[PDB]
Design a protein around this ligand. Structure first.
Ligand SMILES: Nc1ncnc2c1ncn2[C@@H]1O[C@H](COP(=O)(O)OP(=O)(O)O)[C@@H](O)[C@H]1O
Ligand code: BEF
Ligand code: BEF
Ligand SMILES: [Mg+2]
Ligand SMILES: [Mg+2]
Lengths: 415, 409
RNA sequence: UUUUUUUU
């Protein structure tokens, strides 16, 4: 008997289930769940709820739900300050426990006992090392994207491993003009993560992008999808993004390998510039002087932790939009991240995919994510591709890789 | 028994030692019972004089910011030895009496690692007579490693001397930080005498811990997770500590990364004057970082202050162009790194033609400068990439720039 | 008014 489980089930099964208990005529869907929960409480049976914690300024908090993009919701579960102090809870902590309907003079479900804090024992949460105190590091463990199934979509993953490898805790960018292939390449990334790295906690944050891409992503990726389309204001974009990044930080505190696929971070950087207080100083392109400190900390949250776990963020960026702002935002994030995979519009207009700008792509300290021979073969491959043009490079590399199933067999053939 | 020593020792020691006798409470109790025994207590830190007259010995673990374990310094002690912000002080300390919240300083044993009575009367930093760098700080190791190529090309392109005021100018991902890391290793390799300080301002956290583990010196960091107000304060303490050591005839070298983002931090804190330069830079924002960078200088009296700081260009923001060109009119050494060279994966990605050091004849022998001048004319007609691929390969044949000059003739 | 836009 769980609240969010009742919210997921269709209304048809809820109305039928409510009639089995013997209730009055079945009112809006939200009322069906509420009336069913109350009747179950009358029997003496226990009730359960869950959600990500958000501590308000007064000291208490609520358990936001994913169906509201972790925003204020009618089914939020109140968390008393005493409960927060007892287990050292902070914003982002996923909480599950027994709940009770609101009494007379109350408007929210209350939390009686917390069973699980971040998918673990509540006691283990009391003693922990905070995210701000974790010792940072360069990416060590390689997150190989290559399927190896000889698929035609696998070409994008294979070229990615050769141009700019991705490790745990990476802070990368999929930089390209509109319609170059950023979103689908991000989708291609989500598929390889779900297949090759099911151990990682995969999240897909969609900020100020197309709505049909939201449903396409949530029915394609094997993970959680938090979205805030361009139908939403910048105020919502920021708040939604803040909740996701804090939930990631909390899981990293539990030695988890979290991956955040952001699209787009340039749209998110614009959102911050919309809500930022005017400083009297504006950068070239119309970007406030203090507007990029917030998005830089969001993107900068991604990091490799020595104590355990990691936070990876692969976000898409826009360039050559005619607006200098996007060049400033991109260059600022490049001075923050450690990996950039460029996509060329010139290649995309020839319908050559993946339309990857090989020379401009790359990863920092890639020797820590590749074997000694792998790096030496990638190093030689770049020297050969560099003199080529943008299009000739991809047409050459894709035709060579298509001859074999894996890059390892391609390297053996390369000899 | 020193307080700093007791803060570095693990908690297990405080337990075992405590039986023989929070971490802030235990250390406080152990030291408190050391005074009743009559035995002396010691502590250390960097002094910061507040506006009222008294001061506090800040700790390096708190990045020289306000700390719970800071040591109060009486105003009388400041007058008796002419102490100023930045002085490193060690001495006997006493646990706070009732009504006090901090340990107190009884008497100073060492002021900047010297005797207090001798630091009382010395020529101030603002009174030292400046000069152009006339003492060469050779970067080349001569071990034959691939990492030495950066140092060798650096010696040929832009020699660094004691008191230099240089810049590692380049766009993002060109190789500024690792260029800076290579410089730190050569200073610890060839110049153990110089006091090496590494100031990391508004940069990546992973580069902080990485720096700390490969550099033989002090690492003061303030990552981009920190406010601009913290950047300034931390940078103010480091530059003042450097000035104090220079007053003691010591060769201090500060490797900053990045100074461009430090200038941004000053621009965020600076009061609005109503006049804003092109790019969003307040007309008074650059004064503070300009006197920070301009603090570096060669001193005739003895010792010097060297500052090699990285700078950003081609960021799409006219602000960084104003900042870079302003520091260029302040410094006297510039090492540019090219993005198109780094994108071809040619390291070091040094723009040979646009790099150089002022008054380089004071840092090189007459024969050495001749060969550098000849090598200059040969490389100039070449393109950026071809220049590096040419110089790197010719240096690869040799282990030392001296044997490379022998092949020249 | 400055910065942003003009503007490269
Ligand atoms: N001398 C070098 N040798 C090999 N790789 C280098 C060198 N200099 C820079 N790189 C590459 O560039 C990447 C980032 O360069 P970095 O020093 O961060 O430039 P910046 O500080 O200007 O951002 C590193 O991960 C490294 O792989
Ligand atoms: F139009 Be694309 F998604 F940048
Ligand atoms: F991104 Be670099 F460190 F400027
Ligand atoms: Mg898209
Ligand atoms: Mg750098």
């Amino acid at each position: 008997m769980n609240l969010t489980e009742l919210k997921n089930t269709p209304v048809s099964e809820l109305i039928t289930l409510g009639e089995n208990m013997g209730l009055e005529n079945l009112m809006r869907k939200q009322d069906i769940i509420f009336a069913i929960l109350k009747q179950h409480a009358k029997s003496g049976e226990d009730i359960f709820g869950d959600g990500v914690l958000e501590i308000l300024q007064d000291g208490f908090g609520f358990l936001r739900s994913a169906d509201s993009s972790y925003l204020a919701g009618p089914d939020d579960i109140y968390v008393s300050p005493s409960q927060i102090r007892r287990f050292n809870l902070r914003t982002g902590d996923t909480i599950s426990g027994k709940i009770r309907p609101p009494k007379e003079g109350e408007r929210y479900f209350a939390l009686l006992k917390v069973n699980e804090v971040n998918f673990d024992k509540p006691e283990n949460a009391r003693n922990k090392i905070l995210f701000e105190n974790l010792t940072p590091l360069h990416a060590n463990s390689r997150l190989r994207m290559e399927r190896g199934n000889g698929s035609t979509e696998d070409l994008t993953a294979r070229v990615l491993d050769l141009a700019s490898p991705i490790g745990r805790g990476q802070r990368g960018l999929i930089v390209a003009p509109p319609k170059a292939g950023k979103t689908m390449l991000l989708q291609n990334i989500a598929q390889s993560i779900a297949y090759n790295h099911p151990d990682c906690v995969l999240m897909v944050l969609l900020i100020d992008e197309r709505p049909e891409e939201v449903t396409e992503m949530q029915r394609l990726v094997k993970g959680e999808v938090v979205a805030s389309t361009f139908d939403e204001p910048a105020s919502r974009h920021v708040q939604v993004a803040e909740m996701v990044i804090e939930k990631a930080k909390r899981l990293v505190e539990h030695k988890k390998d979290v991956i955040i696929l952001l699209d787009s971070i340039t749209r998110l950087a614009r959102a911050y510039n919309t809500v930022v207080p005017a400083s009297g100083k504006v950068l070239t392109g119309g970007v406030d002087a203090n507007a990029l400190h917030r998005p830089k900390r969001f993107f900068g949250a991604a990091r490799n932790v020595e104590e355990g776990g990691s936070l990876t963020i692969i976000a898409t960026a826009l360039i050559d939009t005619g607006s200098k702002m996007d060049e400033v935002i991109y260059e600022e994030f490049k001075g923050t991240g450690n990996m950039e995979l460029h996509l060329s519009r010139k290649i995309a207009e020839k319908r050559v995919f993946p339309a990857i700008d090989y020379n401009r792509s790359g990863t920092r300290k890639e020797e820590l994510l590749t074997t000694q021979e792998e790096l030496q073969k990638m190093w030689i491959l770049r020297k050969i591709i560099h003199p080529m043009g943008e299009i000739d490079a991809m047409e050459f590399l894709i035709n060579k890789l298509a001859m074999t199933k894996t890059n390892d067999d391609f390297f053996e053939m390369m000899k």
